[PDB]
């Protein structure tokens, strides 16, 4: 009779953490993150204001998640597309937390996992399309469909 031991398969994951500025500027990342999102450290920190990395279709989704994080202190699991150095779009599943130095937020730590195209497309298909408090059928997507965009994305 074999006594209880700790035999384990030891699966391998691909989750990695990153550090961001309050505008979601990537400053610091894991090695796995670099191998997923090919980017030199010098380039990454000196690229944009964070939202320049997001696919256009997910921009409002990510803005809403960002507001949710600022309010509750952390945005739940979200799925969207990142712009790699190769001008590619890869699906990620991310959760972002807000850290406060002294009563005020200091930086954001993001834990994300890379996704395949099929899974990302399925998640996008299931994404909610009706806001809780929209303005009913005003044909806003037809008449104007041109909003200034939320201020949360504004620089600084």
């Amino acid at each position: 009779l074999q006594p209880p031991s700790i035999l384990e398969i030891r699966t391998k994951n691909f989750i990695f953490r990153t550090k961001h500025k309050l505008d979601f500027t990537p400053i610091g990342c894991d090695a796995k993150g670099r191998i997923v999102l090919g980017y030199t450290e010098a380039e990454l920190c000196t690229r944009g204001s964070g939202y320049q990395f997001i696919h256009a279709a997910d921009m409002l989704y990510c803005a809403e998640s960002h507001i949710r994080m600022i309010k509750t202190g952390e945005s739940g699991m979200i799925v969207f597309r990142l712009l790699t150095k190769n001008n590619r779009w890869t699906w990620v599943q991310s959760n972002a937390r807000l850290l406060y130095k002294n009563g005020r937020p200091d930086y954001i730590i993001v834990t994300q996992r890379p996704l395949t195209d099929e899974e990302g497309t399925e998640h996008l298909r299931k994404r909610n399309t009706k806001l809780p408090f929209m303005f009913t059928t005003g044909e806003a997507v037809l008449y104007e469909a041109t909003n200034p965009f939320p201020a949360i994305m504004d620089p600084l």
Partner: protein, 304 residues
Amino acid sequence: ADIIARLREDGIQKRVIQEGRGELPDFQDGTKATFHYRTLHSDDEGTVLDDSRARGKPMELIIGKKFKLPVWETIVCTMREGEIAQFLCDIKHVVLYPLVAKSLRNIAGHADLDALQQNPQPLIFHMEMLKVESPGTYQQDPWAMTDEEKAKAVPLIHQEGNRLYREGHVKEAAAKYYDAIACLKNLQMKEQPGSPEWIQLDQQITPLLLNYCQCKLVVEEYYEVLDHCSSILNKYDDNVKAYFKRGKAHAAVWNAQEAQADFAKVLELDPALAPVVSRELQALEARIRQKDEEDKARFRGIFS
């Protein structure tokens, strides 16, 4: 000057059946033109894919904010009040037809309007205008209003909804509150979160959200009330009205423990009004006891 001479050179050929009445309107940036339309295929099959006046469904139109489709705006430009006309359009203008009639009729996989997706061709357009008004006379609808003017128009919707509620109508009051809430929430997007202006915008939405919750409660729709009251409480946790409404909704859906806790929080936060909460608790207890007695009946000799 001569807009028909411009239209004919533009590539659109039209004919007038019955001229309109009055004077040509400015049709500046932002003008409403309520009119009917009846689109039928020019020569490919000759049938009618879409219709507006056939069943009496005018098409409310505002002239030129963006209106991705340019054809309709130009079509309505060259008419006056009470004018009816018919004409065709080139494939280059309506090449994006599937993006227009996809939901404008359903919301109120089409086999008629989708024929152009495979064989674009000329399409006839039978317009019939009734009224054409510049902004300022008719009541602008909330979506197309400007932030500056809506910041001052919001209280009017609030008071109208309140009057509708007192007068004895809730669905219309609920819609008024919903529209005011949408206007207020959209405004918050223009400011940074947590800023004093953001909080100021957030203070005047709580009364409207509470009124909307009350209106929903009278309609016997308790889960929405639960969601909205929970949303209020997660951020304020000090509103006696929010706690009272949440407890009432919980008691309605047989959430005994949560209703009791909410009423207890109401008591320990604003002890002034005891008897109302006591009556609510006693009514909930009587309902629970009656249901327990009834279940005792259901569950009897279930084994023997």
